[PDB]
Design a binder for this molecule. Structure first.
Ligand SMILES: CC(=O)N[C@@H]1[C@@H](O)[C@H](O[C@@H]2O[C@H](CO)[C@H](O)[C@H](O)[C@H]2O)[C@@H](CO)O[C@H]1O
Ligand code: CA
Length: 179
């Protein structure tokens, strides 16, 4: 297992977690802060609980030594959280950035859908290929995904909430460079 290329680094803008939208008290910066909690002691999670769109994406924009960098990516791990109102999503696509335009850091990363940004244009994304995933997603553990290696500025997971919940919930993601 190589470098963790998703963790926040102190005094560095990158790498940076981003989301299309969020529950304001559950900001998307929670998914790469190296805290993992499946309860409220402490509560630590991104969610879109009680937001208007049932679908939302969460992603990592990559960095090397403080500045923007393409990374070679073939994996993703997601720790889904559940309670009475949030849970793992009923469906998901895992996508990577292909835009010719070099992406900038969003101004408000927890709510990328609310500003003009390359991430909001679906022509800038393609699905990963030859995905290996769990047969069923589970809250309460890191769910591991792998796929064909790609050189990208960013990957995201785009998710629709389960019908019996008010949002999707993630305590932490982790992405690793090749050994
Ligand atoms: C008693 C009551 O309804 N309290 C609510 C809280 O549930 C709510 O917090 C959110 O709850 C959802 C539960 O699925 C999830 O845990 C979210 O992460 C969390 O923010 C709060 C919203 O600020 O309002 C209270 O009314
Ligand atoms: Ca976390």
């Amino acid at each position: 297992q190589g470098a963790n290329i998703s963790d926040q680094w102190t005094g560095s803008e990158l790498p940076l977690a981003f989301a299309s939208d969020s529950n304001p008290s559950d900001p998307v910066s929670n998914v790469n802060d190296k805290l993992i909690s499946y309860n409220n002691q402490p509560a630590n999670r991104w969610t879109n609980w009680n937001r208007s769109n049932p679908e939302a994406s969460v992603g990592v924009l990559f960095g090397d030594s403080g500045i923007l960098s393409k990374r070679s990516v073939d994996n993703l791990s997601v720790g889904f959280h559940e309670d009475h109102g949030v849970g793992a999503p009923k469906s998901y696509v895992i996508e990577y950035y292909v835009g010719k335009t070099v992406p900038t850091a969003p101004k408000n990363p927890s709510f990328v859908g609310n500003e003009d940004h390359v991430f909001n244009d679906s022509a800038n994304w393609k699905p990963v290929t030859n995905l290996k995933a769990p047969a069923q997603l589970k809250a309460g553990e890191m769910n591991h995904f792998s796929f064909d290696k790609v050189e990208t500025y960013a990957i995201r997971i785009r998710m629709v909430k389960a019908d019996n919940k008010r949002g999707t919930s993630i305590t932490e993601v982790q992405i690793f460079a090749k050994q």
